[PDB]
């Protein structure tokens, strides 16, 4: 049970630089790893980079060549993400989320997926591998809905699902291809076959109406990637 | 200056296959003659690249994974294979770039009366993905009764001990396995001949 309170909103002109900091309270900081996702206004989730503080290892998405640099201060138990050469396209909400990781005493680490998200930070400025996700599926209020997610790297890497209700930070409801978190209710189920993964909701409610994104990593595992998105609205 | 291949192979201690050690090697010139042209290598297969041209190849990063298994299990280490090891212990992708090297270790890792210091994972509820390692001891729940830390009654401890002895057939004898993977990342290259 660990919470994250990111810093307040910022405004900058094109070409400026923004620093966003999410303090993580509870637990032990050296045990965790952190990553950064940006939500373009009205568009899907977009991953930037992650960091493992105790080993000081960080990798960023290739679209941000050297603009973004991630760091953290174990002394202060905070994570810093800093963007430079700002542009209008960078206008988005920036989320900081805790990645549940595994770090070995020999040089082994495996990353897994983001379970705890921050409140969010909105920043405004103005002056090759993809997961294919069906854009929208509708289902009847007593029935069951199946949402797919298909990339050619899915036997090699795990998949994770996050539930983003409108005006809300994402919530992980299914992890490690098909695992059940303590919070999400029993109705949520996952399954993987070949290069296909499906999310399964048993007797879907109207409660369970939100965008769903499937996050998985590169074939190499170096970069994570996000699905285009899926709007599940339960038809009346 | 040189990659520590001698430290990896000729080591006093080897880990069990479920807790397989991984050592990241980087920023070192690699002489593959010693590894390629060495005696007593029961198995030595390279899938991604040729061992002849291996010495002159150049990569971003190279990892050396090393562990101990039985003799009948050496065949499972190849890519796209299945078993109680290839699924619950140590898995390689089908885009494997690298080599697998094994040798007979019956003198070192077999004690008279049974070596119960070497284990493998027997039961698990899901295949792991390649290059993933699970050290957990959480009990495998086979059915309705929740285990709740108590074994028996359709609940077992999930790791089994190899139980090596000197008076065993070669297939049931321990073997020392070293897997070499070449990361070839989109970054500056650091190791080659
Ligand atoms: C680690 O290395 C030691 C030195 O061996 C040398 O380095 C390694 C990296 C490799 O290149 C070897 O080819 C080199 O020789 C090992 O101890 C030496 O092992 C050699 C055999 O490799 C052994 O020679 C024996 O000589 C008899 C002749 O009477 C011959 O019939 C045998 O077949 C064998 O060739 C040396 O006596 C020995 N030297 C010393 C100082 O101990 C070491 O362990 C050994 O390796 C195997 C072959 C068995 O001899 C084991 O009982 C012994 O522990 C290497 N491995 C480990 C885990 O320590």
Residue numbers in the entry:
A (entry chain H): 1 to 127, 1001 to 1109
B (entry chain B): 334 to 526
Paper text:
The asymmetric unit contained one RBD and one single‐chain variable fragment scFD20. The RBD structure resembles a high chair with a short backrest and scFD20 binds almost directly under the “backrest” region with a surface area of 629.64 Å2. Among the six total complementarity‐determining regions (CDRs), three are directly involved in RBD binding. Structural alignment of scFD20‐RBD to the ACE2‐RBD structure (Lan et al, 2020) showed that the epitope of FD20 is distant from the ACE2 (receptor)‐binding motif (RBM). Nevertheless, the binding of FD20 inhibited ACE2‐RBD interactions. Probably, slight distortions at RBM caused by FD20 binding (AppendixFig S2) were enough to perturb ACE2‐RBD binding because interactions at the non‐linear RBM should depend on the proper formation of a precise three‐dimensional shape.
The surface of SARS‐CoV‐2 is decorated by Spike (S), a trimeric glycoprotein that is encoded as a single polypeptide but is cleaved into two subunits S1 and S2 in the mature form. Here, we isolated and structurally characterized a non‐RBM‐targeting monoclonal antibody (FD20) from convalescent patients.
